[PDB]
Amino acid sequence: AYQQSRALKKEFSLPMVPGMTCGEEMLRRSYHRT
Amino acid sequence: REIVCVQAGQCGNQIGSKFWEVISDEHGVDPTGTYQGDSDLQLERINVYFDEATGGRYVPRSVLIDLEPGTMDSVRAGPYGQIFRPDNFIFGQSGAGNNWAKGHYTEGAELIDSVLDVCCKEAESCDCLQGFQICHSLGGGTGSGMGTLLISKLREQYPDRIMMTFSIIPSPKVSDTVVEPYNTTLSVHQLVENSDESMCIDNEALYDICFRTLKLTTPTFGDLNHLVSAVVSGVTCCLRFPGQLNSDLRKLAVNLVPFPRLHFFMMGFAPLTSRGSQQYRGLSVPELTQQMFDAKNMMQAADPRHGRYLTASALFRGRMSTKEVDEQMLNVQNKNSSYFIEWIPNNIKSSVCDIPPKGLKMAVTFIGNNTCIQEMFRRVGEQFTLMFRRKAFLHWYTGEGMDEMEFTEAESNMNDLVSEYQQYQDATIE
Amino acid sequence: LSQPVSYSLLVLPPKKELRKKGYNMTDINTTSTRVHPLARWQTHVLKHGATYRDALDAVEEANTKHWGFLKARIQFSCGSFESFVRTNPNDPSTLKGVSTYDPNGVFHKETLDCTLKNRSTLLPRLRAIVDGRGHHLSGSTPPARSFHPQVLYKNCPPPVLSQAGYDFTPMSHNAFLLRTNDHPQGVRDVKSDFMKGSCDYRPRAYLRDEVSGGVNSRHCHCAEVYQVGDYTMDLARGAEIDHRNRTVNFEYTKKGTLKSGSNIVGKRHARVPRF
Amino acid sequence: REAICIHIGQAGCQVGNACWELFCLEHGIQPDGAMPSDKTIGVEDDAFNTFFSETGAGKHVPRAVFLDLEPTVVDEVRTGTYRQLFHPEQLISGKEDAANNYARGHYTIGKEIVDLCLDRIRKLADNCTGLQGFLVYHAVGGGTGSGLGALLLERLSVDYGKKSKLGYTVYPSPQVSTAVVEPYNSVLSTHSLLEHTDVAAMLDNEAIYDLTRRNLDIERPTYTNLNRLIGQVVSSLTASLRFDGALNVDLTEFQTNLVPYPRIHFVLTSYAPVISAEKAYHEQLSVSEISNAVFEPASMMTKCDPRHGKYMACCLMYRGDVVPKDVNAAVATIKTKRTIQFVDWSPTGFKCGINYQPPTVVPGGDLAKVQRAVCMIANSTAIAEVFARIDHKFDLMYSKRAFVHWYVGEGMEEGEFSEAREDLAALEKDYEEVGAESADMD
Amino acid sequence: REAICIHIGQAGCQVGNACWELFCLEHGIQPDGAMPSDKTIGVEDDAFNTFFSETGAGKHVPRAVFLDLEPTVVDEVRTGTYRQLFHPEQLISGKEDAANNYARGHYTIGKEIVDLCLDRIRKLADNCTGLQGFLVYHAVGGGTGSGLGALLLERLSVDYGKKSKLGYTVYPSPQVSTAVVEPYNSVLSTHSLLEHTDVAAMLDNEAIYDLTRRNLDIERPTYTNLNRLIGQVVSSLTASLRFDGALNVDLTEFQTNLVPYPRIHFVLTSYAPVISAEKAYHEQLSVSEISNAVFEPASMMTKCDPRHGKYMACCLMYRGDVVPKDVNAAVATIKTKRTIQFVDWSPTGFKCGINYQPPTVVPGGDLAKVQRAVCMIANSTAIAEVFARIDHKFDLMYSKRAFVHWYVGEGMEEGEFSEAREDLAALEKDYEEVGAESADMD
Ligand SMILES: Nc1nc2c(ncn2[C@@H]2O[C@H](COP(=O)(O)OP(=O)(O)OP(=O)(O)O)[C@@H](O)[C@H]2O)c(=O)[nH]1
Ligand SMILES: Nc1nc2c(ncn2[C@@H]2O[C@H](COP(=O)(O)OP(=O)(O)OP(=O)(O)O)[C@@H](O)[C@H]2O)c(=O)[nH]1
Ligand SMILES: Nc1nc2c(ncn2[C@@H]2O[C@H](COP(=O)(O)OP(=O)(O)O)[C@@H](O)[C@H]2O)c(=O)[nH]1
Ligand SMILES: [Mg+2]
Ligand SMILES: [Mg+2]
Ligand SMILES: [Zn+2]
C-alpha cells in the first residue's frame, strides 16, 4: 500500500528537522508485541 | 519611511486587494513575488511597502481582519492572492451583523489581541516607521467597530506617528443599510478624537464619475476600487520617488489642518479621460488643473460652491516646469478669490515628482479641506435624531450593553463640529 | 533537625616550603579579609552518624595536629555553616566561632510577612471535614440531603423521559447546553483544534427584563421553568453574566470555598385538594 | 458557512423534496450521493459544504431532518428516488397524526416525539464549525405542524440561545381553506411564534395559485409547482452564503435590518421573473424591469396589499449579471413613487445584496431560464389585516365554544384560548401605534 | 502480561465461547491449536502469551477454566467445534444445579466442587511469570453463579492476596425478569461481593436488547449477539496489554483511578461504534463523534441513567488510528457540556489510553468494520438507583417471608437476610452522602 511513499523517502534523504516528517508510526504493518 | 496598511471588513479587503494589485504593477512585482522590473528607480524604495523574503521574494506589509472569512477566501482565490502572508489573515467564527456594538464589544474584544500582536510585529520590523493607513467603511459593522477599536489601541501604542484613514460614507439618496445613522455617528465620534486625517468617499459620486466622465457601459466594483487605489497610491508617490519638490504625509497634515478638529478632507484624481474623446484634448498642466477643480471630479456629494476653502494640496507627477504650477495656482486663487478664506494669504500647497504612473504622461492627486463638509454631518445628525427619539432599532444596541449616554455624547460632539465649521466659515477680520 | 556531616580546613604549607618559596611567614597577620596566596582548601567527610560535638572535636584535633591552620567551617546538611578562626594568630587554644551564614537568610527575611499571611489562611483549609469512609464529621451538616430534587438539580434542568424509541424502560438524552465562558486565571489562550466557544450561544434571557417585555406567555414552563420536588427552578434567574457570557461575581463562604449559585426561586406549598 | 434545515409535517416534507432536489442539481451531487467521475475539471470544490457533508469515501449526505407523526409521507421519501441520499436516522416518523389538533401535537404526542428530534438536531450541530442559523419549514394550519413546530422551536430557543431561527410558514388562505378548525390552530401557534422566532416569512397558497395562473400559463396547478417556487426563493436567500458576489448578506443581517421592535418580525416575500418560455422571447428582462416587478402586488406570495400600510424596511437580493449602478437607479425610481410610503421614523429604508450566480434550471421545471433575478422581503403595517381576519373567524366560533371540548380533552385549559386572543389583540394595537407619524404627536 | 479467565455457570460459559472465538481469530490460532505463521517478519511474536501457552510441539492451550454445576452447557462445549483447543481437565462439570438457590450453591453443592477449581487455578498460576489479575464472568441472578462465585472469590482472595480481581457481572434487569427469587440471590451476592472485588462492571440484558434494536438493525436478537458485544468490550480493555501503543494502561491502573473509597467500586460501561454496515457507510466516524457517543445513556450496556447523578471518575480507552490532540479536543468538549456533571471534589476527572490496533471483524458478525473505536468505564452516583429497586423488591417479598423456608432448609440462617439488607442500606447511605456538596458542609 505505502510502497511509493517509502520509495520517495529513500530517494530524497531529508534531514531530521522538527516539523518535516510526521505520522510515520501510523503507517506500520504489524503492531504486534514482538 | 515605511507605511503599514490595515484592511477591515468586506469593502476594506476588496479595496486592499485592488490597491496591492496597482502597487505590484507600478513596481514590477510578479504575483509570485519575484522582481521583474526594468529600472533601478523601482528597486531603491521597494522597502516602503514590501518586506524582503529570501531569494528574491517580497511580501506586502498589510493586516487583513474580518469576522467571517468569505471575503478573505475570495481574495486568496484572486490572481494576486498568493503574495499575502498566511499568518496575516485574522478571522473569527461569526459575522458582525452590521451592528456597531457587536463589532466593537463582543467579537472585537475576542479577536483584538491577535490583531494587535500582528500590527506590532509588522510595525517593529520597519527601520523607521511612518504613519498607519486604514481602509474601512463607516456604515458597516466590523469595518466601523474593529476599525475604531484598532485605531484607539494603535493611538495608545504609537501616539507620535500619523493615523490616516480612507472611509466610505453613506450616500444621500439611497441607503445600503437601514441602521446607517447610528454606526456613522458613533464612528465619527471615535474618529474626531483619534484620527489625524480622514478622507471621505460617496459611492454615488464614483457612479456619477464612471457614467458621466468615463462613459463606461457596464462598470463593476473593480473599476470603483481601481479609481480609489489610484488616488491612494498617488498621495504617497512623493514618499518613494525623486522629485524637484519632495513632500511627505506629515507635511500634508501640517499644511492642511488649521485647528485640530478640522481634519476631514475631500479627495480627487484628475487625468480621467472619456472613452471616446482623447483626440479632443492634449495633456497640459492647465488641463489637469481644470479637471482638478471641477466638482464633477470630486468623490463626495457636498459641493464647494456652498462653502469656502481653508486649504488645499496638489501633488504633481511628471516632467514639468515649476513656473507653470506656481502661476496656475496663483491664477486660480486670484480669479476665484471669494471661495478662499481671506485671513490665510495662500491656501494651496504644490509638490512635483519626476516619475508618472505607467502609461500616463502626467498625473495629479488633489486633497481639499472645505467647510461644505458640514452639510453631510448635519444630514446624518438629523437622521440620527429621527431614529433615536422613537427608539427605532435601539434595543439591539442596548441589549448588547451600550449605555444610551454614549449616543448623546456622539450627537453633541458632531453638532459641535458642525457649529465650529459654521463659525469659521463666517469669521471676519474686523 | 540540622545534621552536620562535613568539615573543611584552610592550611598553609610547611614552614620549610614557605622558606624555600620565598615568603616571609612573620607577616601572616593582616587587618583585611584576604587570605595568603599559599593557603589551600581541603575537605573531609564525617561518618554516617555524628553530632555537632564530634565535629568540634575533629576541628580542634586538626587545629592541634598541623601548623598553618587559618580557619575552618562546619557545613550542615541544610546548606548552612559556622566559621571558626583563632582570635590571635601564632597562638593556638584561642579558637572560637565568630558568625554563621546560610544561603536563605536575606531570602527568608524579605518574604516573611506574605508567607505568614498566606499560611494563616492555608492551614484552616487543610483540616479534614470527613471521616475515613467519607461521612459527616459530627457537625456542619447540610440542611438538605444530596439526592433531593432541589439539591441535585440546583442549577441544571432535570431529565425528561419518554417511551419513544424504546420497547423497554425509557432513557433520557443529552443536551447542548454550554457553561459560562470562564478561562483559567492567568493561563494563556491555549488550544489544540478549532472548538465551539461559549462566547456565542449566549442565553436569550441576558437582559429580557429591561430591553424587552420579559415573559408574556405561559410557555415559560415548557422549557425554562421546572417543578422539582417542593420547589421551583427558573433557568433565567441564576448566576449573573455579562455580555460575553462570563460570570460577573464570585461568592465565598467563611471557610473560603466557592459557591455554586442557585436557580431555585420560591417554595411551593403544595396541598392536596380536600374538603 | 453551515445551515441546518428542519422539515415538519406534510407541507414541510413535500417542500423539502423540492428544495433538496434543487440543491443537488445546483451543486452537482448525483441521487446516490457521489459526484460524477467523467468530469476532469481537476479542481476539488467545497461549496456544497454549506448543505452537504462528506464521509471520506466521497459520498455526500445532507444536513436535514424530516419530522412527521404519520408514517406515509416519510415512508414515501424512504422509498422514493432520493432513498440512498439520506441517512435513515434523519427520517423520523411516528405512528399516528395530530388530527388537526394543536393540543394533540403540543401536549400529548409531540411531547413524546420531541426528544428524538432534539437528539438528531444535536448530532447535526456537533458536526459543524460555523453554524449560523436554523431554517424551519412548517404550516400553522395543521395540528402537528403548529403544535410540534412551536414546541420544538421553544426547546431549540432555550438550548441553543442566541443562534438565529428563521421560519418559512404557510398561513391559512383568506378564502381557500382545508379544515374547519384552522383559526384555532393558527392563533395558538402564533402565540408561541411571537416569542420564539427571529423572522417569520408568510405564504398563502391562494397567492401562489394566482401567480401561477397569471404569469405562468398553467391552467391546473398543483402543490409541486408551489413547492418549486418556494425552493427557488430559499435558494435565492441562501445563495449569498455559497457563491461570489459584490455585496454578500449573512443570515444575521436580516434580523438586524428588518426588525425595529422585538415583536414586529413578520415579513412579506415576493419574487420577480416568474415568466413562461413563450413570454420570455417576447420581452427583454433588464434590472429595472424586474425591480419594478417586485413591487407590484400581483407578484406577492401572501394575500395582502401593501398599499394599505407603510413600509419600515426592505431587503432586496439581486442574483446574476447585475451591476450596482442599475440597482441604485432602480431603487431611486421606486423611491420616487407616490403609492409607496415609508414611516417617518425610518428614513434609510433599504438593504441591498448582489450575487453573481444566476438561478438554476430544473429539467422538469416551469420557470423560464433567465440571466438575473431579484427577491425581496419587507416589513409593512398592512400585515395587521391578516391577523384581524383570523381573529373575527376565531371570535365567531369561540362565542359558542364550537369545538373546544376536543382541545380540553387533549390536554389544554380553556383559559389558553382567551390568553392567545388577547395577545393577538395587543399585536393589532402594536401595529396601530408603531405606524403613527412623529410630526402629528409633536 | 498474563491474565487468567474464570467462567462460572451458564451466562459465563456462553460468554466464554464468544470470547475465545474472538481471541483465537484475532491472534490466529486454529481451532485445533496451531499457528500457520506465514509472514516474513524475520523474528517471532509474543502477543498470544497473555492468553495462550505452548507445550513445545507448538500446540496452543488457553489460560481459562469453565466452572458449572450442570453438565449440559459444558458438554456442549466438549462436543462443539473447539473440542481440541481446551485441555479436558479445564472443563469441570458437576451432576446437578443449584436450582436458583444461593444457599444450595454456597453451602451444599459448591463446597464439594470448589477444591477442584482451586487446584486447577493453582496449576495455571504456577505456569506463569507475570500474572497481573483475574477476569471473572458470572451472573448474580442464578444459584450457582451467585453461590459458587462468592465462595470461589473468597477463597481466591485468601490464597492469592493482593492480585487484582476485575468482574464483569450481569445484574437483574429492572423490569424484564427470568426468575422469581432474583432479589434474594442478588442481595446476598452483593453482600459477599462488597468485600472481595476491586472493580465490578454491571451489565443488563434489557439494555443490550435496546442497543441492538436501536443501533444495530436486529428485530430478534439472541444471546450470541450480546455475548459478542461483551467479548468486544473485554478485547478492547485487554488490548493495552497485547499490542503496541502510545499510552498503555495496565490492569492495576483501573483500580487506582476508578475507586475513591473502598466500597465505591461499581462502574458503568459503554462502547461507542456499535453500528450496522449501512449506517457505518452513511457517516464518517471521527474521534469526536465516538467520544460524544460514549456519554449518551443510550450507549450503555447497563440500564441506569447517569443524568440522575454526578460523575466521579471516567476512564477512556481509544484503540485504532487516533491522535492525542483529537482526544484532548474531545475531552475538553465533553467538559464544556452543562448537562454532564462531576462531583466538585473531583476536578481532574479523566484517565486516557491510546492503542494502535483497530478492532477485529468476525465473519458472521453484525458490527461494521471501522478504523477506530473507544470504550468507556465510569463511576457515577446514578448507580444507587439499581440497588434501591432491588432492595425495594427484597423488602416486598421479605415482609411476608415469601420463600424463606427453602433458604433455611438448604443451610442458611435467617439472620443473614437482615445483615445483608442492612449492609445494602448502608451502601445506599454512602452513595447519598458522598454526593453532598462541600460548600454546604462548610
Ligand atoms: N404550498 C403547499 N401547501 C400545502 C402543502 N401540503 C399541505 N399544504 C397546506 O397546509 C395546510 C395543511 O397542513 P398540513 O401540513 O397537512 O398539516 P400537518 O402538518 O400534516 O398536521 P396534521 O394533519 O395533524 O398531521 C393546508 O392549508 C394545505 O393546503 C404543500 O405541499 N404545499
Ligand atoms: N447476556 C446473557 N445473559 C444470560 C446468558 N445466560 C443466562 N443469562 C441470564 O442470566 C440469568 C440466569 O442466570 P444463569 O446463568 O442461568 O444461572 P446459573 O449460573 O446457571 O445458576 P443455576 O440455575 O443454579 O445453575 C438470567 O437473567 C438470564 O437471562 C447469556 O448467555 N448471556
Ligand atoms: N467602493 C466600494 N464600496 C463597497 C464595497 N463593498 C461594500 N461597499 C459598501 O460598504 C457598505 C457596506 O459595508 P460592509 O463592507 O458590508 O460592512 P461590513 O459588513 O462590516 O464588512 C455599503 O455602502 C456598500 O455599498 C466595495 O468593494 N467597494
Ligand atoms: Mg398530516
Ligand atoms: Mg444453570
Ligand atoms: Zn408550550
PDB file of N, CA and C and ligand atoms in Angstrom, chain C residues 219 222, chain D residues 106 151 154, ligand 6:
ATOM      1  N   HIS C 219     -45.870  29.813  28.306  1.00  0.00           N
ATOM      2  CA  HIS C 219     -44.994  28.808  27.722  1.00  0.00           C
ATOM      3  C   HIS C 219     -43.617  28.760  28.368  1.00  0.00           C
ATOM      4  N   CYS C 222     -42.711  25.326  29.757  1.00  0.00           N
ATOM      5  CA  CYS C 222     -42.438  24.193  28.878  1.00  0.00           C
ATOM      6  C   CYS C 222     -40.945  23.918  28.768  1.00  0.00           C
TER       7      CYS C 222
ATOM      8  N   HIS D 106     -48.867  19.443  20.675  1.00  0.00           N
ATOM      9  CA  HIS D 106     -48.060  20.111  21.695  1.00  0.00           C
ATOM     10  C   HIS D 106     -47.987  19.337  23.010  1.00  0.00           C
ATOM     11  N   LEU D 151     -43.443  23.720  19.870  1.00  0.00           N
ATOM     12  CA  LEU D 151     -42.721  23.103  20.981  1.00  0.00           C
ATOM     13  C   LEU D 151     -41.236  22.928  20.667  1.00  0.00           C
ATOM     14  N   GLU D 154     -39.418  26.293  20.624  1.00  0.00           N
ATOM     15  CA  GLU D 154     -39.225  26.692  22.015  1.00  0.00           C
ATOM     16  C   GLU D 154     -38.032  25.984  22.655  1.00  0.00           C
TER      17      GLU D 154
HETATM   18 ZN    ZN F   6     -45.589  25.244  25.119  1.00  0.00          ZN
END
